[PDB]
Amino acid sequence: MKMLEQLEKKLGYTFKDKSLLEKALTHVSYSKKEHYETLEFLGDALVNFFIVDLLVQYSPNKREGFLSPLKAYLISEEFFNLLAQKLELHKFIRIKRGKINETIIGDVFKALWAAVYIDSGRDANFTRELFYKLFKEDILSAIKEGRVKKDYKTILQEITQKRWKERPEYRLISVEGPHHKKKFIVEAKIKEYRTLGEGKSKKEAEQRAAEELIKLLEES
Amino acid sequence: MKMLEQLEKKLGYTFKDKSLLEKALTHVSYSKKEHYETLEFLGDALVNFFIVDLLVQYSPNKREGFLSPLKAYLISEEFFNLLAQKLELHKFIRIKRGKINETIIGDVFKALWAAVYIDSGRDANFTRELFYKLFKEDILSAIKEGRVKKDYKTILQEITQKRWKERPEYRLISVEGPHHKKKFIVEAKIKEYRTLGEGKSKKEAEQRAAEELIKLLEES
RNA sequence: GGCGCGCGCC
RNA sequence: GGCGCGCGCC
RNA sequence: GGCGCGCGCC
RNA sequence: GGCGCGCGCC
RNA sequence: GGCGCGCGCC
RNA sequence: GGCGCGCGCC
RNA sequence: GGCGCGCGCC
RNA sequence: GGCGCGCGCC
């Protein structure tokens, strides 16, 4: 069967307007016109909604402070690539050699959903259910394991502990501003590498200091 | 008539579960339990989708580079407050004195949409149309006038030109990295105030330098 | 948009 | 032959 | 009319 | 560079 | 979570 | 009496 | 078992 | 502070 059919089968949906599906699979490098860009823009918001709606229904904790870290991972390039793999998107994409990467597979994943949405006559309910039918389980699992984007302090430690079997040091340099709105400046150190970071709390300051130190190291 | 009815009338929708609507209107300051937080989280993604879907259908230019600045304004606190005013949200919100502001009116606006969505049995199509019936025109107008969040360079100029009838100066300090991936460092100046900014293009560098200079000025 | 330039990738 | 990133001139 | 900023198209 | 849209200052 | 502290707002 | 921001101790 | 980081609850 | 979940190093 033709390639579009193969994907429609993996998708469990058949397009009325095949050009829509093909456009979602088309990178600008392969065609200056009718490529996935606009569908990606729409797909981004669409899928974001699908994910959040599911997250808010199945997350054990309904507090935003808890929902946010989960959502960050659930709408991340890493996770989208995980879901796309089930569809083997890579072999369907029309693109020049040497240009494909995970950002692209992610873009196409999003565009594809925008295409289905449009092809269905902008039926958000139908498209959402189609989405869940394919990925609800993968999403619930991630929510169950509480997967999240590792934070900077955690990332820094893993780095320094591997390359030196040592942990970075954080120290308060200064505190400014009104007592109910203090500004904290903290330094992160490893070996002779040093970086500063400011925040509204010591925790936040350290996070930023860690972020910078990671860059600094990565550069040297 | 009761307050919930007044709002349902302005909304053109009547809730089956009034507690849902009331919760969307309830700030944590008024009640530690059953306040709008989770609905705001869901409403944010929902409304974002409503806006983007409309933008992608009615924007004259379908390129992302063009869509993005419009979307930034269309999903901004400023615009949401504009749409909320039509509903007079402020008088329906349950909150303690001295805490309400535009971020809150924005949160409630979002929560309300999440509430309607849930109350309708998670019917995204119905809710979307309800949304458009009330705000499609306001959105199309904004898209027609091409409203966008003023950028830093523009903001800086307006500042310096008002307070000094003068324009800031930008100058290239240095350029680093591979020729196909240069790093630009630029300085923005006004009077003796000076700030630096880096970017992948001179334009971007200046933008960041302008961003910082605005802060610096605002502080002094 | 036109005329060019440096760099990189196929 | 085709793309990409940046820069300059009109 | 001038100066300048942003964006679109050519 | 040109033209267009938006805006600031004169 | 408990016991406190500085500050701010009603 | 009620909230908020930050910090400390267990 | 130890040290440390993040998050949740109490 | 305790307990829980995740992880890094020993």
Curated annotation (Swiss-Prot), chains A, B:
<comment type="function">
    <text>Digests double-stranded RNA. Involved in the processing of primary rRNA transcript to yield the immediate precursors to the large and small rRNAs (23S and 16S). Also processes some mRNAs, and tRNAs when they are encoded in the rRNA operon. Probably processes pre-crRNA and tracrRNA of type II CRISPR loci if present in the organism.</text>
</comment>
<keyword id="KW-0507">mRNA processing</keyword>
<dbReference type="InterPro" id="IPR014720">
    <property type="entry name" value="dsRBD_dom"/>
</dbReference>
<dbReference type="GO" id="GO:0006397">
    <property type="term" value="P:mRNA processing"/>
</dbReference>
<protein>
    <recommendedName>
        <fullName>Ribonuclease 3</fullName>
        <ecNumber>3.1.26.3</ecNumber>
    </recommendedName>
</protein>
<dbReference type="GO" id="GO:0005829">
    <property type="term" value="C:cytosol"/>
</dbReference>
<feature type="domain" description="RNase III">
    <location>
        <begin position="4"/>
        <end position="121"/>
    </location>
</feature>
<dbReference type="InterPro" id="IPR011907">
    <property type="entry name" value="RNase_III"/>
</dbReference>
<dbReference type="GO" id="GO:0046872">
    <property type="term" value="F:metal ion binding"/>
</dbReference>
<dbReference type="GO" id="GO:0006396">
    <property type="term" value="P:RNA processing"/>
</dbReference>
<keyword id="KW-0378">Hydrolase</keyword>
<keyword id="KW-0698">rRNA processing</keyword>
<dbReference type="GO" id="GO:0003725">
    <property type="term" value="F:double-stranded RNA binding"/>
</dbReference>
<feature type="active site">
    <location>
        <position position="110"/>
    </location>
</feature>
<feature type="binding site">
    <location>
        <position position="107"/>
    </location>
    <ligand>
        <name>Mg(2+)</name>
    </ligand>
</feature>
<comment type="similarity">
    <text>Belongs to the ribonuclease III family.</text>
</comment>
<dbReference type="GO" id="GO:0010468">
    <property type="term" value="P:regulation of gene expression"/>
</dbReference>
<feature type="domain" description="DRBM">
    <location>
        <begin position="151"/>
        <end position="219"/>
    </location>
</feature>
<keyword id="KW-0540">Nuclease</keyword>
<keyword id="KW-0479">Metal-binding</keyword>
<dbReference type="InterPro" id="IPR000999">
    <property type="entry name" value="RNase_III_dom"/>
</dbReference>
<dbReference type="GO" id="GO:0008033">
    <property type="term" value="P:tRNA processing"/>
</dbReference>
<keyword id="KW-0819">tRNA processing</keyword>
<keyword id="KW-0460">Magnesium</keyword>
<dbReference type="GO" id="GO:0004525">
    <property type="term" value="F:ribonuclease III activity"/>
</dbReference>
<feature type="binding site">
    <location>
        <position position="110"/>
    </location>
    <ligand>
        <name>Mg(2+)</name>
    </ligand>
</feature>
<dbReference type="Pfam" id="PF14622">
    <property type="entry name" value="Ribonucleas_3_3"/>
</dbReference>
<keyword id="KW-0963">Cytoplasm</keyword>
<dbReference type="Pfam" id="PF00035">
    <property type="entry name" value="dsrm"/>
</dbReference>
<comment type="subunit">
    <text>Homodimer.</text>
</comment>
<feature type="binding site">
    <location>
        <position position="40"/>
    </location>
    <ligand>
        <name>Mg(2+)</name>
    </ligand>
</feature>
<keyword id="KW-0694">RNA-binding</keyword>
<dbReference type="InterPro" id="IPR036389">
    <property type="entry name" value="RNase_III_sf"/>
</dbReference>
<dbReference type="GO" id="GO:0042802">
    <property type="term" value="F:identical protein binding"/>
</dbReference>
<keyword id="KW-0255">Endonuclease</keyword>
<feature type="active site">
    <location>
        <position position="44"/>
    </location>
</feature>
<dbReference type="GO" id="GO:0006364">
    <property type="term" value="P:rRNA processing"/>
</dbReference>
